[PDB]
Design a protein around this ligand. Structure first.
Ligand SMILES: COc1cc2c(cc1OC)CC(=O)N(CCCN(C)C[C@H]1Cc3cc(OC)c(OC)cc31)CC2
Ligand SMILES: CC(C)CCC[C@@H](C)[C@H]1CC[C@H]2[C@@H]3CC=C4C[C@@H](O)CC[C@]4(C)[C@H]3CC[C@]12C
Ligand SMILES: CC(C)CCC[C@@H](C)[C@H]1CC[C@H]2[C@@H]3CC=C4C[C@@H](O)CC[C@]4(C)[C@H]3CC[C@]12C
Ligand SMILES: CC(C)CCC[C@@H](C)[C@H]1CC[C@H]2[C@@H]3CC=C4C[C@@H](O)CC[C@]4(C)[C@H]3CC[C@]12C
Ligand SMILES: CC(C)CCC[C@@H](C)[C@H]1CC[C@H]2[C@@H]3CC=C4C[C@@H](O)CC[C@]4(C)[C@H]3CC[C@]12C
Lengths: 473, 473, 473, 473
């Protein structure tokens, strides 16, 4: 199964990235050119290793800053097992990254193990990854073995293990893009969550820095730790007030107790103020983009109607006409912005036929002429039907006018006013204007909408074009 | 009338959601399939019950947090009548929700009482609604009947009645969507008001939490209540300073008196800081969307002219030509962005005829050829007329050029320069270029705009097409 | 001249609102129907009275709050002359508003003095305007003439003169709309300035309220004035610290000295915090809209190229082809988003001819065939020319291919590779492909761009269409 | 080389601004009309002088405010060499600006030395530039030579050298526009960086002002310097706390130590609060524009699909059909918004042919009819091919239907269901519907997609049109 895990298995993502099985099976074979040493970027092992690393790299980036800053002994047996075990998992990841193909913009997944992948990692992120993976602090401690300066350096050297933020950022970005293909995550929701994670991590690290700079200076008499008398407090009361102090600078509220007296404090407060304000300005920006994208369809309709109001304003249309047009837009588009012609053009011939049959088949089927027609012909006619809304009192057809189009009534109560009978109120499902299909003369009756009336109009020219394609009918 | 209230009555919303009466009367009959136990989501009873619940659920969500936090006795007769009466109204609502059809995306309103509605509520919000409706606090008090721990639990158990926020949020969203169909509320104004309501409610609850966590700990010596000496103050001075403290953290101003000394305070301040900053970031985001949507039409014109400036920049047009084009855009579009062809195409044949007659009928009626024509023919010609603005000094028609279009003058003072008379200044309402309609030769006079001149041009080809449809004229 | 001032004079705004002189002179006559009692909303008297009122209403809204709050005696002779003189100017304005026509959306300017204007003001803003104009404080003082309560009421009654904010807001909105027609003020710059004015005015009034509520309570012992010992300080040190306190709550910085001890202070601080945060959220929103509209043209190009990158990504085009396409877009559109077809269609026939002659006349004039042609024919051909950019190495024409288009070279160095001579490098202004105009055969030479090459192509079909219109040439 | 440096050399910017070499060489000659006294705005000397000035003007605008405010003696030999040397470089720049051509909107680069450039600088920025370049402070000191008032004026007079901000702003804007042509810098990234530079500079200057106003008043007893006892502290502890105080007002956090007691402090704090809040509101605005422009392509796709959802909602399509359409959009556009017709129309004939050959040549080449065709004919057919995605189960071709289009299969497994054989599963690269090219009859087999199936369809009409152009084939 080792070859199977290292190879991109047939999944919804694979079949949507590479075209189809025969394409996925071609890529699986391309990996089999190198042996036991090539992992595909989309491989499930890369998926499983990346899910193991991301849990480990959030835990390390939350436990490691607290362990150096708020605990005096980091050479104790539990902290050496934790830092060696994490460093081993991270060092394996560096070896695996040398043998994992890299997705490439405008190309395939670089896969040649000797130079395509090994010489791209070395020229790119190998150093940041080497410094984070290696236990520099333990190497210095072993080489060096006046101890208090040694303990102060080890604490600074063990924060080179926070460069794993490079891998957490890179791995999250790689798998978020794979998930965007696999699912349709809203871009704004994915982006705001990456910042909320980055803001929480930076607030944790700023809280730790606010106690590390005072700790690495032996708690100077003007440091907040000494001034608030929290040098001897428990790690919880030291961490909670350091996070409180760092969150307060970030959301820019105020301070822990008082304004910074010392120069290490005045500068570490200013770094946490600049980091905090930039993160909040970005959160207000990400929040604005999420809020704009939630109401995009309703905002786009309002921008469409406002332009209709500007047309009416330019032509100075009377207020009565301006309300007839507002009532038409409310009852024609129903608050919905869509382009039927563009949306229908994008759809394939089978999906267009299904949408047209659901919308128009019932009404056309009732008409006697289309009842006995071949389903192929009816489907051609159904495409021709155009949707038209007539407001109350409007004359859909006027007596004595040339008849260029017949109407199928989807909804609304119309009324056929004539000279002989003068009383015929057609309702939902009824058809009018039928005679105007092969006579090419003049309409004998006038139909007036008596309520809004949503109708489907087939123009005599369009009927002829579909009729030309099917000669018998 | 019980059947009538439970059934969706013929209203502007019903006739705009379901197509028309015969459709509304069909739905009213669909409800009559189940008896006395089915309420339509659009029913007026659902409207009236939801208006009763929303007033009750704002009152309960404002009175209930204050009653538990700032008043020691909640077993007094007035607070038991208030909490039993509200719990009865809320419990009825749970029974009614089991028998109310649920609007469904992509479908009808689920209406079958036995499983379509009952088994969807149980699998969805029944629990949150059961916990909020039941008086858990009173059930615990009755079962349990060392009392101080009992009073502290009852206070936490009586805040499970704040889960009614689920119903206030769901009911407000259901009826705001019904109102959006019933009226055209701006999406941004509706969304900002839902946040201002949610921000005010969260600020009220954070103020109460800031006194409840200290109260449930017997006012510990480091709590703000004890430090500011407000343990024995009136409920007004305790509530006002707790709201002041919670609003200050939310708008991120500062603190009530000093930075939090205790760990319950440092953590409850940090929760109110994170809740407050996220609510304000969302208010700055909702404010940006309201401000962008108020000036959408003016912003869209500026983006249209900026593109004209970019065309002029690419072609490096001289500054004099760039000002002639700016003056044309000011006097043609008048600061208004609209697409006449798209806006006219959307309108039905009667509304298009009305807009065209108001804009063009007066001018065409003056012309002698169109004066005696059948109103049907004139309406066809009026559609052909195209609107054209000629700047001062422009030559609308040049002598000796082939004549392909005649001009009707809506506004502006033109002037007919010829060789014989050489002085004829036509003004508003005048027509020129008329001879170029059936001669198909060359123009004998040159007309120069002497002011901006808004004219309507009928091309000889368009005159022929309308003339082809009406043979006699 | 009294009739002339009350009548809308022929100005750039009048001639752009009403169509032209004969339309403006028609409106001037419509005003002359009522006598000495009708002022047109666009009248210059309305302009001059509104410029007098706006200076007076900013001065009153800045001097009047300070005079009541920071000065004990407002019955002194200088403050009675100032408040009577301002009240007289404001009372005249109420009389004039009864006789000024009101611009109406979807209509003309309501002008009938007896009911169209008088009964619309009474039903609209007469009350707010009556309360602001009348000296209620002086009427109460005269009627009432235990004095300390009288002085406290008069101070509250004299703040009903701050309702003139209604007129400043209405007059600024009326004249900003008139200026938008008169000039093209950016909407965002006009809107941000209205808020900066409203924010400065609300900050001034919040500063005064922070000292008025303590003053109207005889400086209670817990008020900030008494706690900071500023009861007996000069009006400058009392106003400056009250503005500092109100600006600090508004920009949400902190407090003047300490968090509010009293309940009048805790509530007046909370009102100034909610007013301040809403104004700042709106300033961040107006700033976002100004910043987005400054770079609209550059942002729109980036959105256009990003879509080209998405087309290339979907088709998985090789990285080399992706760079050829990026270089084409840089050298064809030059970072400019414009639609030549839409921008040209909007322009009138004279402006289109001028832009086409400047862009193309020099190059076409050099060609021998078009040199002797009638300027009418050349102008028709110049419209047909299409702009095309060929990248270095591209083959503009290939030997042996059917010739459907000739090329005029605007810029770039091409090269004619043939079999006989095989060396001819054409440069700026040169024409190639000329033989392919009346032969309808095959090209004998292949022209390869040797640098980018911006050329104008005239298709043989387009040459024939212009040639069809002019038979002799 | 002096003439060469002053002349616009042939560079990527020059060849993209002026059309090509022959155009650049024409401009180089236009400069040679004036002698040794005309520098082109795009000249490399202007580039090199502007890069020298910008380093010098950032250094002066950072060192000069600190030198006046935090150092008592500015007449010392090192500060006189620094201020004379910088003033000499700045005075040369004023002389050079008199002889450098100015880029002009809508025109060429003003180049005539006597009046085009000299009389435009004098009427524009000569004064601000003269006041900044001249050492006013030293001129006053020499003329004047009771000394403490002289030292206080000199400190105010030496801040007229901060008007060089005019040149830093103008030079940065000129060279950022030149770089935008030279490279495609994102507008949002360039604009946010100009603000981060302006915010850092204003925060530096506000920190210095907070100590200069107290210094110029002899450290009054209520000034923060005296109250925090920092009058005698080192320049580092005075500057660091003044910057801390000014950054705190700007990001609106709080204060250095306490709220301002004196009136110089209450007003200098209010100026730094208004300057700081306006800069942060602009940073939140620039951050919103950068964040919106990073995800423009993904946001635009979501707005396109939301409109498809609104079309489906208006027609009330069943939920099953709504999921077939969502799956089509995911597998047709693949999350990418692009307009193939618009993107292809913009590209030149060679780039369109290359994109079409890469996308379609392999599949068409396999077909036997197109295998022996002339490459010219195949390229014409390849343009006709249209891309179509058929979902699983869809019938691409139905037996007995008239055949109007043949299909080339790019990806997916189809299946040819017939009556005779009834089993033929075509895969990637296969072609079906071929017989429907010259028969004009009815299809004998029905092909059903058995997986998504991305195919290229050539319509019989389009095949005929390309076949009409090439008669032999
Ligand atoms: C961060 O601040 C700096 C910014 C910059 C540079 C240095 C900086 O450090 C002070 C480098 C530089 O000069 N260029 C880039 C050098 C690359 N070349 C290709 C562009 C430059 C060289 C040249 C020459 C030109 O004359 C034709 C010209 O057109 C005006 C433009 C240019 C501008 C950016
Ligand atoms: C809800 C719909 C619109 C889909 C949106 C998907 C969202 C909710 C998902 C997709 C990927 C997710 C992210 C994946 C990984 C991380 C990194 C971690 O350190 C913090 C959480 C964070 C940032 C997740 C937050 C939630 C997330 C952004
Ligand atoms: C003014 C025009 C554009 C129409 C806009 C309608 C606005 C003003 C209306 C429509 C529905 C209304 C909301 C309905 C119910 C609630 C919940 C309540 O707890 C707070 C107020 C709030 C949130 C209302 C605020 C105002 C509101 C949003
Ligand atoms: C600079 C270009 C884009 C044109 C923009 C015009 C701007 C600068 C002008 C037009 C009208 C002006 C406003 C007119 C009247 C007032 C009310 C006053 O109490 C404060 C200033 C304020 C709000 C002005 C600010 C500047 C303003 C908004
Ligand atoms: C990264 C891609 C998108 C290109 C963007 C270019 C950006 C990073 C470059 C282009 C020009 C640059 C600016 C040029 C000059 C200055 C003035 C200086 O006082 C502060 C930095 C600042 C403001 C630079 C910041 C970075 C900058 C804005």
């Amino acid at each position: 199964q080792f070859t199977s895990m290292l190879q991109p298995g047939v999944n919804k993502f694979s079949l949507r990235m590479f075209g189809s099985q025969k394409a996925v099976e071609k890529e699986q074979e391309r990996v089999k050119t190198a042996g036991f040493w090539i992992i595909h970027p989309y491989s499930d092992f890369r998926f499983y290793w990346d899910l193991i690393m991301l849990i480990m790299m959030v835990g390390n980036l939350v436990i490691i800053p607290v362990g150096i800053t708020f605990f005096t002994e980091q050479t104790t047996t539990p902290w050496i097992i934790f830092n060696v075990a994490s460093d081993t998992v991270f060092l394996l990841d560096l070896i695996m990254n040398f043998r994992t193909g890299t997705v490439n913009e405008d190309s395939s997944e670089i896969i040649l193990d000797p130079k395509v992948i090994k010489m791209n990692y070395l020229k790119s992120w190998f150093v940041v990854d080497f410094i984070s993976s290696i236990p520099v602090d333990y190497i210095f401690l072993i080489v060096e073995k006046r101890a208090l300066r040694i303990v102060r350096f080890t604490k600074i050297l063990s924060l080179l293990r926070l460069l794993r933020l490079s891998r957490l950022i890179r791995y999250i970005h790689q798998w978020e893009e794979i998930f965007h293909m696999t699912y349709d995550l809203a871009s704004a929701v994915v982006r705001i969550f990456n910042l909320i994670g980055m803001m929480l991590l930076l607030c944790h690290w700023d809280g730790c820095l606010q106690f590390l700079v005072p700790l690495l200076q032996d708690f100077p008499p003007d440091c907040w730790v000494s001034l608030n008398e929290m040098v001897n407090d428990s790690w919880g009361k030291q961490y909670s007030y350091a996070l409180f102090k760092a969150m307060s600078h970030m959301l820019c509220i105020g301070y822990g107790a008082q304004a910074p007296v010392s120069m290490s404090d005045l500068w570490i407060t200013m770094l946490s103020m600049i980091v905090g304000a930039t993160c909040y300005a970005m959160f207000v920006g990400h929040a604005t983009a999420l809020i704009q994208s939630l109401d995009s369809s309703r905002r786009q309709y309002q921008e469409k109607y406002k332009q209709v109001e500007q047309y009416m304003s330019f032509h100075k249309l009377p207020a009565d006409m301006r309300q007839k047009i507002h009532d038409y837009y409310e009852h024609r588009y129903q608050g919905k912005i869509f382009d039927e012609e563009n949306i229908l053009n994008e759809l394939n011939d089978p999906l267009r036929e299904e949408i047209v049959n659901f919308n128009c088949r019932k009404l056309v089927a009732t008409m006697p002429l289309f009842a006995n027609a071949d389903p192929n012909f009816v489907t051609a006619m159904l495409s021709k039907l155009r949707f038209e809304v007539f407001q109350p009192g409007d004359y859909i057809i006027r007596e004595g006018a040339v008849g260029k189009k017949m109407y199928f009534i989807q909804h609304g109560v119309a009324g056929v006013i004539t000279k002989s009978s003068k009383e015929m109120k057609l309702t939902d499902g009824s058809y009018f204007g039928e005679i105007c299909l092969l006579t090419k003369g003049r309409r004998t009756a006038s139909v007036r909408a008596d309520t809004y009336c949503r109708l489907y109009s087939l123009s005599v020219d369009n009927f002829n074009e579909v009729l030309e394609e099917y000669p018998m009918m």
